[PDB]
Design an enzyme around this catalytic site. Structure first.
Site, PDB file in Angstrom:
ATOM      1  CD1 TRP A 130      -2.171   1.758   0.410  1.00 47.25           C
ATOM      2  CD2 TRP A 130      -2.041   1.929   2.875  1.00 47.25           C
ATOM      3  NE1 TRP A 130      -2.705   2.856   0.865  1.00 47.25           N
ATOM      4  CE2 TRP A 130      -2.471   2.915   2.137  1.00 47.25           C
ATOM      5  CE3 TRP A 130      -1.216   2.591   4.151  1.00 47.25           C
ATOM      6  CZ2 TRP A 130      -3.085   3.932   3.101  1.00 47.25           C
ATOM      7  CZ3 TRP A 130      -1.715   2.606   5.137  1.00 47.25           C
ATOM      8  CH2 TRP A 130      -2.440   3.925   4.082  1.00 47.25           C
ATOM      9  CG  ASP A 211      -1.675  -1.301   7.769  1.00 41.84           C
ATOM     10  OD1 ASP A 211      -2.637  -1.337   8.355  1.00 41.84           O
ATOM     11  OD2 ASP A 211      -1.379  -0.668   7.230  1.00 41.84           O
ATOM     12  CE  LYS A 246     -10.597   0.685   4.446  1.00 41.30           C
ATOM     13  NZ  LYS A 246      -9.253   0.552   4.487  1.00 41.30           N
TER      14      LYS A 246
END
Ligand SMILES: Cc1ncc(COP(=O)(O)O)c(CN[C@@](C)(CC(=O)O)C(=O)O)c1O
Ligand SMILES: Cc1ncc(COP(=O)(O)O)c(CN[C@@](C)(CC(=O)O)C(=O)O)c1O
EC number: 2.6.1.1
Lengths: 396, 396
Positions: A130, A211, A246
């Site tokens: 990312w 993460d 999310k």
């Protein structure tokens, strides 16, 4: 004093946003960013949320400042989401959670903390990764190097190559792992492959920084924290930069946490007091809404129950869209066997489309993938799956 | 790796808060942190706020990510709040606003932007000042030197020692002004004095950074943006770090802004694009709620009207709490004349109380003020106005 300032380049992910919100063409499809979508292509407010928001609405008597680390039960509920109810990190009081503006804001404050109370200089983030891990880390001091990850030729995890390159990191370095749902690629390691890294990193003395932004979107929930839990048992210290954007569809309310685990209470205590100071000089305290909402749903068995069903739908709506994509790909006449897409996990899929292919798509065809050829499966709909699969199939 | 970490000193302000909570004495009072209170002593959620939260609950269909700079209308509304209905910065497009997590986040986003896109190496903050101006800038790299402000014998502000100490700031240096309600002290510059500084900084080549966090608490929303406006008329580049946590009672939702004004649109555009980059790596995007609210209330004439009245109430209640504080003091047994408490503006008063006096109070009478002897007037109520004023008098 600004006359001199360079126009920063477009964010590779957030640029599309604007790029899309301007393509005036009719059937324009947006496979960019990683935000969910239901059969209709909307990113709705979860039902449990709406309900938690109703509650708050009437039950809130004040807006007075949270603490530096946010809402207590938000942290405690977060820890158990991470580690697991019984859990010794919890039962020994080794962990300490600060609530933060996004899992992206959990990363930064870990970073500013690390680069200022710790001996680190380097943080290792896989290839590919990312693209903002680099930027949040550089912004802190820290320098980032890459470790091998993805076997592109055969669309999987090049473990040897992963391990061999990590061997070149030093004891005291911070190595960044994604808890589950590798971004992009969505290739994650097996429980076995996770224990090994757990053991290695213990021998080599690296500091693992996880993460964790998609708990629940690949397999399950207590099953997504499996890798993370294999490290916790072994290590004495770790840092989790958690996100509930999310899995709670809370993208703009900014909810996440920064969990700091240390060898013991007094230490983590002492260390955590520095982390607090690092936040105090950033945003001061966290935004109350989104977390007041998450604590509520997680605090209440009715709601929580609703919530887990709502997430289990989102998840499966995807596992489905994987299949349908490859299947329509074939029936719409592709060459490249894309069966690997089903092997992946989460909202995305490393497509394997050339940068200039993904450029033709946005132009000849209105289709919008990230330049890496990353596509958000969770934005593919039974209604757009056809015009999409024809575009993609028309640029190979 | 965390074994060696040193425990951070408690925040002078935010640690009184822990200090007070753990305090068991019943008649304990808390003049610490700068959060508004009502006759009863609660930090209620303003009405127009609940009304807007209700609209949102009903009308909001999604939680999808705001843009890096947040909500447009919030931005446009903030600019008229600062600059004017049809101020030239607005019609010229010289300004650009980013929604940030609080006014302490607009401050930091600016520090990270400056210390990375400009040559700025130091920032001048007054003496005294809100103790987190330092901690914030120093985290950006920037060094803070300090200009004279508070004449403490006569509790006024000697423009001289202020002007003189500033004469030493170089050109291209950042000078930080408090838009109104200086923190602590509450002494502000007249308009005349403001235009003299407007002109000075225009010559000496300074880039003024304004910390505007109490718009509306001294005289009014417009009468309080006069200084910022005298400056805005003269300068080509400016940076405003505004906040909505007090005047909208939105403390824990974190609502503020970072306004960037430059010589023309293309410059600001270019500059701003880098300010966006700096936010992308901190928290990624701003938290929607409180900004959504503020936008809602500010763009609805009814709600606005409710809001302005609720603010006018707060503002006047404190004004009422000032004189009552004097008077009572004034004949509850005092000798020291505190009539200057009335000259001051905003939530706090610079009491000019020995930091040993502020210790006796907290330890012998549970009265809590900050070690500078900053007391929160907006936390004084007719009910505690007597035991408090009895404490003060016992330790002076
Ligand atoms: C792997 C990964 N980690 C952490 C974060 C931080 O997210 P948060 O602040 O929103 O909690 C994201 C978000 N990345 C998205 C989903 C969006 C983005 O580009 O920022 C993505 O498209 O990858 C992420 O994808
Ligand atoms: C001078 C000043 N600037 C900016 C801010 C930023 O507030 P925000 O992030 O909450 O917008 C405050 C808040 N300072 C308080 C009111 C509280 C604190 O210490 O944080 C104070 O007691 O002075 C302030 O006092």
């Amino acid at each position: 004093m600004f006359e001199n300032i360079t126009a920063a380049p477009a964010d590779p992910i957030l640029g599309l946003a604007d790029l899309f919100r301007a393509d005036e063409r009719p059937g324009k499809i947006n496979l960019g960013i990683g935000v969910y979508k239901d059969e209709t292509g909307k990113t709705p407010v979860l039902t449990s949320v709406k309900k938690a928001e109703q509650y708050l609405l009437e039950n809130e008597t004040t807006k007075n400042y949270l603490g530096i680390d946010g809402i207590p039960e938000f942290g405690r509920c977060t820890q158990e989401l991470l580690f697991g109810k019984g859990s010794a990190l919890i039962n020994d009081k080794r962990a300490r959670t600060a609530q933060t503006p996004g899992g992206t804001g959990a990363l930064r404050v870990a970073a500013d903390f690390l680069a200022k109370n710790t001996s680190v200089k380097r943080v290792w983030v896989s290839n590919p990764s990312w693209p903002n891990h680099k930027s949040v880390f550089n912004s802190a001091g820290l320098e980032v190097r890459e470790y091998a990850y993805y076997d592109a030729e055969n669309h999987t995890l090049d473990f040897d190559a992963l391990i061999n390159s990590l061997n070149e990191a030093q004891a005291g370095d911070v190595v960044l792992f994604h808890g589950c749902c590798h971004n992009p690629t969505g290739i994650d390691p097996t429980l076995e492959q996770w224990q090994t890294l757990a053991q290695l990193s213990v021998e080599k003395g690296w500091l693992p920084l996880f993460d964790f932004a998609y708990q629940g979107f690949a397999r399950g929930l207590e099953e997504d924290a499996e890798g993370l839990r294999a490290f916790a048992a072994m290590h004495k210290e770790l840092i989790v930069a958690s996100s509930y954007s999310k899995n709670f569809g809370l993208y703009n309310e900014r909810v996440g946490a920064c969990t700091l685990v240390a060898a013991d209470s007094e230490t983590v205590d002492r260390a955590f007091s520095q982390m607090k100071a690092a936040i105090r000089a950033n945003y001061s305290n966290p935004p109350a809404h989104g977390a007041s909402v998450v604590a509520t749903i997680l605090s209440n068995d009715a709601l929580r129950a609703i919530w887990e069903q709502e997430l289990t739908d989102m998840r499966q709506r995807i596992q489905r869209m994987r299949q349908l994509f490859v299947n329509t790909l074939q029936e719409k006449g592709a060459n490249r066997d894309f069966s690997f897409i089903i092997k992946q996990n989460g909202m995305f899929s490393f497509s394997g489309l050339t940068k200039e292919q993904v450029l033709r798509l946005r132009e000849e065809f209105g289709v919008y993938a990230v330049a890496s050829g990353r596509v958000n499966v969770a934005g593919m709909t039974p209604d757009n799956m056809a015009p999409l699969c024809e575009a993609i199939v028309a640029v190979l």
